[PDB]
Amino acid sequence: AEFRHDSGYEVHHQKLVFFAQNVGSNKGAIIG
Amino acid sequence: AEFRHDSGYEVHHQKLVFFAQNVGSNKGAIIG
Amino acid sequence: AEFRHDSGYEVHHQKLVFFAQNVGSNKGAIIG
Amino acid sequence: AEFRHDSGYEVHHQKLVFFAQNVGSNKGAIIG
Amino acid sequence: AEFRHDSGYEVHHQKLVFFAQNVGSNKGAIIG
């Protein structure tokens, strides 16, 4: 399996976030 | 299997998010 | 498995974030 | 598994962040 | 597992950050 993405764009304006993980942008491994 | 995506665009304005993971944009591996 | 991303762009303006991990941009390993 | 990223760009303007870890940009290992 | 990143760029302007760890840019190991 492979996941190929090119030239992504992102804008983030999160408000009032609690108990979150990687809130915003995530591109790496995250384990709960 | 393969997943090919080109020139994605995203805007995020999440509010009042609790106990979330990778809230916003996610492109990497996440394991629960 | 592989995850290939090229020339990503990101802008972050999070406000009022509590108890978060890697709030903003994340590209490395995070373990809960 | 592998995670390959090239020429990333990031701008961070977080405000009012409490009890956060690696707030901003993260690319290394973080353990809770 | 491996995490390969090349020629990253980052600009940080965090304001009003409390009880944070590695606020700004992080690329090393952090343990809670």
Residue numbers in the entry:
A (entry chain D), B (entry chain E), C (entry chain C), D (entry chain B), E (entry chain A): 2 to 33
Paper text:
Alzheimer’s disease is the most common form of dementia and is neuropathologically defined by the presence of extracellular plaques containing Aβ in the brain parenchyma and intraneuronal neurofibrillary tangles containing phosphorylated tau. Peptides between 37 and 43 residues in length are generated, with those of 40 (Aβ40) and 42 (Aβ42) residues in length being the most abundant. These Aβ monomers tend to aggregate into insoluble fibrils, the structure of which has been extensively studied in vitro by cryogenic-electron microscopy (cryo-EM) and solid-state nuclear magnetic resonance spectroscopy, revealing a spectrum of different polymorphs. Two human fibril polymorphs have been determined: ‘type I filaments’, which are mostly associated with sporadic Alzheimer’s disease (SAD), and ‘type II filaments’, which are observed in familial Alzheimer’s disease (FAD) and other neurodegenerative disorders with amyloid brain pathology. Here, we determined the structures of nine ex vivo Aβ fibrils from six different mouse models by cryogenic-electron microscopy.
For tg-SwDI mice, which harbor the Dutch (E22Q) and Iowa (D23N) mutations within the Aβ sequence, we observed three different polymorphs. The other two polymorphs, labeled DI2 and DI3, consist of a single protofilament and account for 37% and 11%, respectively. For DI3, the atomic model consists of residues A2–G33. However, as described for DI2, this atomic model was built into a map with a medium resolution (4 Å) and therefore has limited accuracy. The model is the most likely one based on its fit to the map and the fact that it yielded the highest score in the side chain assignment method. The overall DI3 fold differs from the DI1 fold and aligns only in residues V24–G33 with the DI2 fold. Therefore, secondary structure assignments differ from DI1 and DI2, showing two β-sheets in the N-terminal domain. The fold of DI3 fibrils is mainly stabilized by a salt bridge between E11 and K28i+1 and a hydrogen bond between E11 and S26i+1. The C-terminal kink in the structure around K28 is stabilized by a hydrogen bond between N27 and the carbonyl group at G29. Additionally, a hydrophobic cluster around V18, A21 and V24 stabilizes the overall fold.
